[PDB]
Amino acid sequence: MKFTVEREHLLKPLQQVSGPLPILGNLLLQVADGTLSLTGTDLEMEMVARVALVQPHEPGATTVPARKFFDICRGLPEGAEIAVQLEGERMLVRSGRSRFSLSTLPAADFPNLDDWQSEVEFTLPQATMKRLIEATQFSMAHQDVRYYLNGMLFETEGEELRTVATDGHRLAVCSMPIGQSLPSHSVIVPRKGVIELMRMLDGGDNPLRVQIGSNNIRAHVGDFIFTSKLVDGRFPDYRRVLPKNPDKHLEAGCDLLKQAFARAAILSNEKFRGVRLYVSENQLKITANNPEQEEAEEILDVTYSGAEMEIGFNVSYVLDVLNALKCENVRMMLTDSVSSVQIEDAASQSAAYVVMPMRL
Amino acid sequence: MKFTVEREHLLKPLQQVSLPILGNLLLQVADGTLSLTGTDLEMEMVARVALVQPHEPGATTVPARKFFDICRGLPEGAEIAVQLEGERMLVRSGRSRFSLSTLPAADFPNLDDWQSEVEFTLPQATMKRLIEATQFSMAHQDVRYYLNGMLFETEGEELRTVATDGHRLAVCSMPIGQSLPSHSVIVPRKGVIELMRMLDGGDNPLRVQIGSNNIRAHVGDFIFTSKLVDGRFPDYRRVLPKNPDKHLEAGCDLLKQAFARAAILSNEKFRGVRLYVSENQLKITANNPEQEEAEEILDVTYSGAEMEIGFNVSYVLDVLNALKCENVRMMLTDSVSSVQIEDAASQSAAYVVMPM
Numbered sequence: 001m002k003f004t005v006e007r008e009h010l011l012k013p014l015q016q017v018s019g020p021l022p023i024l025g026n027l028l029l030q031v032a033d034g035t036l037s038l039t040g041t042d043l044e045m046e047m048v049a050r051v052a053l054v055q056p057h058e059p060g061a062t063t064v065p066a067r068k069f070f071d072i073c074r075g076l077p078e079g080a081e082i083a084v085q086l087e088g089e090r091m092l093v094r095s096g097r098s099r100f101s102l103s104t105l106p107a108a109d110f111p112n113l114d115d116w117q118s119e120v121e122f123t124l125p126q127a128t129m130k131r132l133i134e135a136t137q138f139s140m141a142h143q144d145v146r147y148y149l150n151g152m153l154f155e156t157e158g159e160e161l162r163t164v165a166t167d168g169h170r171l172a173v174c175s176m177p178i179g180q181s182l183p184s185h186s187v188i189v190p191r192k193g194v195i196e197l198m199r200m201l202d203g204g205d206n207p208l209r210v211q212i213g214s215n216n217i218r219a220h221v222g223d224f225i226f227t228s229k230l231v232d233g234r235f236p237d238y239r240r241v242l243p244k245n246p247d248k249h250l251e252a253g254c255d256l257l258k259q260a261f262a263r264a265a266i267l268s269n270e271k272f273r274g275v276r277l278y279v280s281e282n283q284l285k286i287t288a289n290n291p292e293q294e295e296a297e298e299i300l301d302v303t304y305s306g307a308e309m310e311i312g313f314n315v316s317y318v319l320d321v322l323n324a325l326k327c328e329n330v331r332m333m334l335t336d337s338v339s340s341v342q343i344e345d346a347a348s349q350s351a352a353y354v355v356m357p358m359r360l
Numbered sequence: 361m362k363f364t365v366e367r368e369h370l371l372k373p374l375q376q377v378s379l380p381i382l383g384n385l386l387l388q389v390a391d392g393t394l395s396l397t398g399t400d401l402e403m404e405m406v407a408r409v410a411l412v413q414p415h416e417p418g419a420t421t422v423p424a425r426k427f428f429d430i431c432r433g434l435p436e437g438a439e440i441a442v443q444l445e446g447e448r449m450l451v452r453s454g455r456s457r458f459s460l461s462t463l464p465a466a467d468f469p470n471l472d473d474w475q476s477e478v479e480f481t482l483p484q485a486t487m488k489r490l491i492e493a494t495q496f497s498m499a500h501q502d503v504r505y506y507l508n509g510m511l512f513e514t515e516g517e518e519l520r521t522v523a524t525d526g527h528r529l530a531v532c533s534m535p536i537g538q539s540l541p542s543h544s545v546i547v548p549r550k551g552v553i554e555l556m557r558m559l560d561g562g563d564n565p566l567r568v569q570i571g572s573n574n575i576r577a578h579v580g581d582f583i584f585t586s587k588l589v590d591g592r593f594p595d596y597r598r599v600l601p602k603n604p605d606k607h608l609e610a611g612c613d614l615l616k617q618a619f620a621r622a623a624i625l626s627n628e629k630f631r632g633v634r635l636y637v638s639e640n641q642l643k644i645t646a647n648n649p650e651q652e653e654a655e656e657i658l659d660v661t662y663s664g665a666e667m668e669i670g671f672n673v674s675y676v677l678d679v680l681n682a683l684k685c686e687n688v689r690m691m692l693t694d695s696v697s698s699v700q701i702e703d704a705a706s707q708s709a710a711y712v713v714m715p716m
């Protein structure tokens with residue numbers, strides 16, 4: 001196995017196949033039919049990056065320490081030529097008067113995911129999948145014993161793809177039309193897989209092809225192919241959590257709302273983070289207090305014409321939402337003091353967020 | 361106690377000054393000035409803010425982080441009205457209202473009074489230079505406590521910093537244009553951090569006062585005071601190689617990046633690399649327990665005798681990173697002695713690394 005390649009034709013592929021038993025700490029390298037393939041895996045998911053070889057090359061395959069190899073390539077100067085050749089049990093890397101000899105492990109020992117058949121497929125712009133994931137990712141659970149929440153639901157229905165995330169306390173949903181007729185279907189992508197998928201998306205003109213099997217998901221964009229197992233479990237139904245008829249709409253500028261809440265949060269309970277809202281004609285008042293009896297109060301002009309009411313909620317969750325929206329204006333959809341709140345960009349129903357009420 | 365001040369005039373001060381009462385800031389309105397004081401009993405920062413609007417005298421103590429976070433949290437151009445009521449300190453701006461808990465000003469600790477013995481003035485940029493040139497070589501948590509801080513030495517008209525952990529050393533000397541006595545104090549690491557943090561970067565000069573057990577720095581409307589560390593700091597003069605007459609010169613960034621690449625295949629714990637010097641060439645090698653190997657060859661300016669020597673590469677990289685320069689000079693003795701490293705264009709800082 002031998003190849004010579006420009007440094008910058010390796011770095012993005014290396015970035016993608018690297019991670020965030022010891023062979024899982026290596027990258028599989030393969031030279032075949034004019035192409036260098038690099039694969040990383042943690043047994044649950046895998047990334048394959050292909051790079052065209054325009055310079056003389058010789059076929060073969062090995063595995064090499066991922067972090068050391070990446071760091072060597074990155075440490076070489078911009079534009080450097082990197083010549084690689086297998087020499088016994090070692091991989092030799094040379095560029096200029098810099099030389100390196102890395103340990104290998106056999107390509108035969110690099111683990112594969114089981115083979116599987118694709119049952120649902122669709123293509124969509126990368127920007128669209130990026131918006132879907134970014135809209136909801138922050139509401140996924142981390143390491144909950146309810147293992148099926150440590151991930152994101154992907155739901156196809158009609159011509160729409162939808163993502164849902166919840167940690168069992170708060171919920172995020174995003175839906176976007178993708179212009180293809182789809183079966184009604186849903187799967188749970190593990191949280192790490194979501195993150196890896198997200199980082200594969202450069203926001204470019206390459207279309208994204210998604211293929212979903214009964215136990216796996218695959219995403220293809222240009223020179224990259226990502227494959228992950230699905231979480232084998234039942235996701236909760238997002239539909240029963242959405243408020244039925246939130247008939248009291250408050251609208252206000254996102255930043256003003258966010259800044260008022262961030263100030264109020266400073267004097268809220270450090271563990272439970274409850275803040276109270278008092279809504280009246282075109283006016284919102286936010287209060288917070290803590291066990292030390294310190295108190296915050298914010299009054300803002302907003303748009304509102306419903307009946308007066310008050311509601312409490314977790315200010316950390318509400319701030320998470322307002323930071324995810326990054327938009328001009330926000331809509332808070334209210335029912336009463338004992339019902340959840342749904343929050344949206346005032347100018348788009350594509351993403352919605354639900355936060356539980358708190359009795360304070 | 362009442363004041364009303366622009367957000368812009370509180371923020372920098374609050375940031376500079378930021379057992380329960382140690383978590384609070386002491387606020388004092390007296391003689392048309394707001395004083396803000398923060399302390400951890402070892403050191404203290406005081407900021408003075410002139411009050412151009414109506415105000416009433418008095419003092420209290422309030423949670424530092426919360427007050428800072430509320431003031432920062434308010435919008436550009438906010439006016440911040442403050443008054444003691446209770447028990448509580450009220451902060452108001454726009455239609456944002458806050459009630460904070462207090463501890464009595466009477467309880468706020470004072471550093472003991474002390475007398476200035478040595479005093480001088482120098483530019484902010486010179487103190488920045490002195491500290492950044494050496495800070496990275498201080499020990500962290502060494503049982504020789506005085507190595508966890510930084511020596512500040514006056515000699516002739518020079519102010520000098522020295523930092524060392526036993527394994528490598530940094531020294532930097534700068535002229536300050538005043539006749540100074542010969543004196544040395546050791547400033548604790550925390551104090552060195554704060555001393556740096558108060559510069560700022562404007563053209564306000566720094567005024568330093570040194571006592572037998574304290575150092576004080578005045579810049580602008582801020583006064584920082586720290587206790588000193590006792591103990592006998594080593595003599596940089598005995599650490600400098602007596603006659604390192606083998607002189608190698610190389611590009612700083614070229615040299616750094618070569619070491620940084622070799623370091624990848626050095627032992628993770630011991631970090632050793634080998635240097636082979638010969639006529640106008642440097643070879644750097646490294647290897648690890650997995651028998652992986654790195655080799656770098658660089659063109660350098662060298663016409664001394666050949667030799668080889670081992671070093672902890674993290675120590676060398678620390679030096680090269682702290683030098684912000686075009687070319688470096690490595691000054692060698694033999695395979696079992698230290699190396700001295702300087703900017704090829706300046707002698708005002710020097711670095712010493714022990715061989716492995």
Ligand SMILES: O=C(O)[C@@H]1CCCc2c1[nH]c1ccc(Cl)cc21
Binds near residue numbers: 525599
């Ligand atoms: O080890 C010792 O007993 C003294 C005192 C601490 C600093 C230091 C010593 N000897 C040194 C030799 C070299 C360097 Cl870089 C620093 C030091």
Ligand SMILES: [Ca+2]
Binds near residue numbers: 018045046
């Ligand atoms: Ca992977």
Ligand SMILES: [Ca+2]
Binds near residue numbers: 159177179
């Ligand atoms: Ca449609």
Ligand SMILES: [Ca+2]
Binds near residue numbers: 205
């Ligand atoms: Ca294009």
Ligand SMILES: [Ca+2]
Binds near residue numbers: 295297457
């Ligand atoms: Ca209040």
Ligand SMILES: [Ca+2]
Binds near residue numbers: 626627633634645646
């Ligand atoms: Ca070595």
Ligand SMILES: [Cl-]
Binds near residue numbers: 411
């Ligand atoms: Cl004022």
Ligand SMILES: [Cl-]
Binds near residue numbers: 531532707708709710
């Ligand atoms: Cl010097």
